Amino acid sequence: AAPAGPGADMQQRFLNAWRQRLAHGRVRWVAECQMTAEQFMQPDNANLA
Amino acid sequence: SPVALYHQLKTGLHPGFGFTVVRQDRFVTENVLFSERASEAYFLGQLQV
């Protein structure tokens, strides 16, 4: 995003306008807790491709 | 609980109880046979068409 205006509520611009789409779907890129052979396996790692 | 037993097992904590693992397995054999002089009194009927 582009930042806009004062920086004070810029965190608050992020928290309120995103909260519906942020809290609903799980993020892809937290896969660090996935193990080594739990990476390449097809179960739970449809993000393989 | 079975919801909790994801986060114990998929992450890698041993959940306090351990398993025995049963599979089936199948093997071809090559069986030798034997018999004595007369084991089967055998019979043959008349053909019909």
Contacts of B12 in chain A (CB under 8 A): 35
Instruction: Give the helix ranges, DSSP H, for B1-49.
Output: 4-9
Whether A31 contacts chain B with CB within 8 A: no
Give me the resolution in angstroms, 1 decimal. Answer: 4.1
For residue A10, give every residue at least 6 positions away whose Cβ sits within 8 Å of its Cβ, in sequence order, or none: A3, A4
Experimental technique, in short, is cryo-EM
Closest-CA residue of A relative to B6 is A44
Amino acid (1-letter code) at residue A1: A
Dihedral pair phi/psi, residue A3, rounded to 5°: -75, 150
Residue with structure tokens 């018999």? B35
Contacts of A35 in chain B (CB under 8 A): 12
Our CA-based measurement puts residue A21 at a distance from the nearest CA of chain B, in whole angstroms, of 24
| DSSP code for B21 | -
| DSSP code for A26 | P
Q: How far is CA A4 from the centre of its chain?
A: 22
Contact present, A10 and A3 (Cβ < 8 Å): yes
Which has the closest alpha carbon to A26: A48, A44, A5?
Answer: A44
What tokens were used for B49?
Answer: 């068409």
* Number of separate helices (H) and strands (E) present in chain A: 2, 0
Residue with structure tokens 């079975």? B2
Contact present, A15 and A6 (Cβ < 8 Å): no
C-alpha A34/C-alpha A42 separation (Å) is 12
